[PDB]
Amino acid sequence: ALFEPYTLKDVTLRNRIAIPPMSQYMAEDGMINDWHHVHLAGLARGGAGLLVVEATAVAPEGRITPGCAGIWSDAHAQAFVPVVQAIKAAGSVPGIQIAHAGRKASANRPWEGDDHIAADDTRGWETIAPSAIAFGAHLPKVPREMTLDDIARVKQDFVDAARRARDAGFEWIELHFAHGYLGQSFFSEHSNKRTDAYGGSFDNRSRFLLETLAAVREVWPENLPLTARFGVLEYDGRDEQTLEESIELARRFKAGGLDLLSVSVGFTIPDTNIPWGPAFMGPIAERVRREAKLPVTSAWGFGTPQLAEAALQANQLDLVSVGRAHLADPHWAYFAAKELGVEKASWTLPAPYAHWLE
Amino acid sequence: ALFEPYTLKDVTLRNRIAIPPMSQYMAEDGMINDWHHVHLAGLARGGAGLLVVEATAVAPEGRITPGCAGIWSDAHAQAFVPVVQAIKAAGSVPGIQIAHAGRKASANRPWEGDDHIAADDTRGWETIAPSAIAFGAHLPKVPREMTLDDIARVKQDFVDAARRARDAGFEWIELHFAHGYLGQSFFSEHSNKRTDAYGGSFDNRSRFLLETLAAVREVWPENLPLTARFGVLEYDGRDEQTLEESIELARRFKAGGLDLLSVSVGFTIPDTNIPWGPAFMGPIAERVRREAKLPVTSAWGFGTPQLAEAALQANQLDLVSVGRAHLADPHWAYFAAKELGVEKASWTLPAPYAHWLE
Ligand SMILES: Cc1cc2nc3c(=O)[nH]c(=O)nc-3n(C[C@H](O)[C@H](O)[C@H](O)COP(=O)(O)O)c2cc1C
Ligand SMILES: Cc1cc2nc3c(=O)[nH]c(=O)nc-3n(C[C@H](O)[C@H](O)[C@H](O)COP(=O)(O)O)c2cc1C
Ligand SMILES: O=c1ccc2ccccc2o1
Ligand SMILES: O=c1ccc2ccccc2o1
Ligand SMILES: O=c1ccc2ccccc2o1
Ligand SMILES: O=c1ccc2ccccc2o1
Ligand SMILES: O=c1ccc2ccccc2o1
Ligand SMILES: O=c1ccc2ccccc2o1
């Protein structure tokens, strides 16, 4: 099942293996470079059906860190063009995740402290969010409460980013509404304490996300998959109520033209108890898929090829996202094809490799 | 031992893992392209101490196939510059193998027949060699016997190639005197039937190789390793006599400034019986190392990390060359570091990978 193709709108993936967005923290002032080119091109040649580029900020302040990729100008977008073209030459579908880190912005690279940047560090910047409340823990900075104009500006930033992504040749877009960043923080009552149209009720908390989706849909081609990543629960002791609301929003996403949902955990606050384990998201993704009638992918521990295969056969997932295993071995799809007994497994790879590995 | 550094002349490799030349057959009219850039850069980031670029023809007719890389003009050399710079940025030493395919030239890509190109195929060309005798089998073309001017011209081609390699920034050069191509074919009595100064006696058969080495040494910096690959036996029933002469030539190579010998099998003729097996070259490489007092590397089946480690501990090898395992997994050095219990094995890789794999 892992090596059956998948067709969504006009796009066909050669298999069900997706490489999820994985931030590299190697960009400079948002501009990607040869780190990203070789990294992504090498992954595409590894055999995966879909490669989703790391979180790419729609605005400078929406980067997580000083090394995050950005697409907030045409020059930033044009930098993606040769990379997109290399992914395509390798036969993988190029996708990109567009993002805004919200209150989690202005942080250090994970191997450089992983924490909010010190006040007098010239690299740092003010963060913005639905409400002036800090994440806490290693991210204690209190964000600035967004004005209605801020909200309009960020929505337009998402539109501009999607427009650029389209024109750079991406065939698959993913709105980053997960992992506690801006979009996730608008939906969660933990972080959203607004009393205007963007806070309070379920309708109001959903509003930012739904409007951003609608605005993006105006510029993103109908025949190319339009997707999002969304944390559907927090493991914060409110899981049944949170999952119910998240599934309801997924229904609204679908009605608003969303083709597939990448199902994640919220990470909106630090005080949680996540039951980490191989493929632990499987049952959650399946419930979203069933109850919203929407294709899904998810991640965490699917680098064991048999787990990926089991998830697909059980219809918990439509695509299986495999992250860290691809940092370890960019040719993981070849490893998986062998593990699963695929005919001519070496031809998961391009000829100059496949010929010799048969 | 596999992860101890190695210093040769002014060059220091971060470990004893070498990626040997592996032809990609993806070049056009000798010019390399983004296939080679991403392929080589990705390998460099995988952790290997030394990356030797595939056989690169010193002249158009010295390509094995229409897809082989070339360095027979300054424009061909300049194309290597960004690749060399990427290898260095990744902390690997960039080397290159310069070559002339001799009677084995003008062949199809291995996945396109692997045989001599048909007479009326517009891609083909006349081959040149010490004597007009065919390899046989899948390479039945009779080469043209080289004139003394041909020999002068090819030596100068090797000099020009080494000069270009130097200027492109390579830190390690390997003369391809192995695998039945031009250099190997001059040394072997099977293929060299000349009656002039370049044939007959051991001195005469060695001459082409020794003069080419001397000529190259004039332009290749003294402080950068000067090496060659050389088939030391054929498994043709003449192994003791052939090994004795090959070791004698290795002594002459050393006296003439050779820093390290990549020990191989000759492949000069098809009628042989090679005892293929994991690390089977080990005992042969050790005998050359001992009897010529010269550092060596070799290859074939060392992708099993424990075999690589054993070879080094037994002083059979100074560097271990690992080829096909790197086509399967460009991050093989990381796999090896884990297998061998290296401290902080993930940091065999660059930070954007290592941080997450610890
Ligand atoms: C280095 C790294 C970078 C990541 N970057 C992103 C990102 O930019 N956006 C995102 O939504 N998830 C990101 N993730 C989360 C992954 O997409 C994925 O969900 C996670 O690694 C779990 O899958 P795995 O066990 O196969 O690695 C990242 C994960 C890692 C390890
Ligand atoms: C695809 C491929 C290309 C190769 N190209 C070259 C080459 O250009 N020059 C050379 O001397 N050897 C070449 N070789 C031989 C390798 O360098 C090496 O000796 C051989 O693969 C055995 O090592 P291994 O078992 O680790 O693969 C090539 C081997 C392969 C599989
Ligand atoms: O959305 C994200 C962005 C970055 C990241 C890094 C490590 C782990 C998870 C992550 O999720
Ligand atoms: O799988 C492939 C096959 C061919 C190719 C050519 C150039 C660049 C990347 C490529 O990837
Ligand atoms: O194949 C791999 C290798 C390492 C690793 C580390 C963390 C998570 C997943 C991983 O997968
Ligand atoms: O010198 C060489 C050049 C190419 C090659 C291809 C496959 C196997 C061995 C080889 O050796
Ligand atoms: O190992 C590395 C570390 C950094 C780096 C930067 C640019 C290109 C390649 C690189 O490789
Ligand atoms: O790791 C590997 C995987 C495949 C393979 C095939 C032939 C020779 C060596 C190999 O090494």
Beta carbons of A102 and A125 less than 8 angstroms apart = no
Longest dimension (CA), chain B: 64
Question: Nearest to residue A40, comparing CAs of A76, A109, A86, A75?
Answer: A86
| B179 pocket-lining for ligand 6 (C-beta < 6 Å) | yes
Spell out the residues 6+ positions from residue B212 whose beta carbon is closer than 8 angstroms to its own.
B154, B155, B158, B175, B183
Contact list, A39 vs chain B (CB under 8 Å):
42, 352
Which single residue is written with the structure tokens 């399967």?
B328
Contacts of A25 in chain B (CB under 8 A): 352
In angstroms, the CA A139 to CA A156 distance is: 27
Q: Which residue has its alpha carbon closest to ligand 2 atom 5?
A: B22
Per DSSP, A155 falls in state H
- Spell out which residues of chain B touch residue A331, defining contact as CB-CB under 8 Å: 328-330
Closest listed residue to residue A288, CA positions, set A255, A318, A243: A243
Gap between the Cα atoms of B271 and B236, Å rounded: 7
Adjacent-strand bridge partners of B7: B12
User: Which residue in A237, A132, A242, A265 sits closest to A189, CA to CA?
Assistant: A242
Q: How far is the CA of A55 from the centre of ligand 3 (A)?
A: 8
Residues A232-250 as b/e (b if ≥16 CB within 10 A, e otherwise) read: bbbebeeeeebbebbbebb
Ligand with minimal distance to B347 CA:
7
A23 lines ligand 3 (CB under 6 A): yes
**Domain hosting residue A337, numbered range:** 1-358
Model resolution, angstroms: 1.8
Over the range A116-154, which residues count as b (16 or more CB within 10 Å of their CB) and which as e?
A: bbeeeeeebeebbbbbebebeeebebebeebeeeebeeb
The residue to mutate among A280, A324, A331, having the most atoms of ligand 5 within 8 angstroms of its beta carbon, is A324
| Residue pointed to by tokens 């607004």 | A194
- DSSP notation for B117-159: PPTT-TT----EESSS---BTTB-PPPEEPPHHHHHHHHHHHH
How far, in Å, is the centroid of ligand 7 from the Cα of A41? 15
Q: Say if ligand 4 is within 6 A of residue B34 CB.
A: yes
One-letter amino acid at A349 equals L
Domains of chain A: total: 1
Helical packing angle, B34-45 and B81-89, nearest 10°? 20
Question: Helices A34-45 and B81-89 meet at what angle, rounded to 10?
Answer: 90
Q: Which chain A residues are Cβ-neighbours of B352 within 8 angstroms?
A: 24-26, 35, 39, 327
Question: A25, B328: Cβ pair inside 8 Å?
Answer: no
Interface test with A, best of B28, B81, B329, B338 (most A CBs within 10 A): B329
Whole-angstrom CA distances from B247 to A120, B22, B115, B185, B233 are 66, 25, 32, 17, 10
Please, which residues have CB within 8 angstroms of residue B328's CB and are 6 or more apart in sequence? Answer: A331, A334, A353, A357, B303
User: Residue B173's closest CA among B226, B215, B99, B231?
Assistant: B226
Report DSSP state, residue A206.
H
Q: For residue B282, what is the domain's CATH number?
A: 3.20.20.70
Question: Which residues of A does the annotation mark as catalytic?
Answer: 181
Judge whether B98 and B176 are in contact, CB under 8 Å: yes
Task: Tell me how far apart the alpha carbons of residues B84 and B89 are, in angstroms, rounded to a whole number.
Answer: 9
SS3 letters across B293-335: CCCEEECCCCCCHHHHHHHHHCCCCCEEECCHHHHHCCCHHHH
A264 to chain B, closest Cα gap in Å: 19
In the block, residue with structure tokens 């040149």? B128
SS3 call for A162: helix
Instruction: Evaluate whether A22 touches A327 at the Cβ level (below 8 Å).
Output: yes
Contact check, Cβ <8 Å, A25/B357: no
Q: How far is CA A151 from CA A73, A155, A158, B176, B195, in A?
A: 19, 6, 11, 64, 87
B22 lines ligand 8 (CB under 6 A): no
H-state helical runs in chain A: 34-45, 74-78, 81-89, 148-168, 182-187, 202-217, 239-255, 282-292, 305-313, 324-328, 332-339, 351-357
Instruction: Give the residue on A whose Cα is nearest the Cα of B331.
Output: A329
Identify the H or E element spanning B185: helix B182-187
Which tokens hold the place of A139?
A: 């991210």
The minimal CB distance from B324 to the residues A39, A335, A356 is found for A356
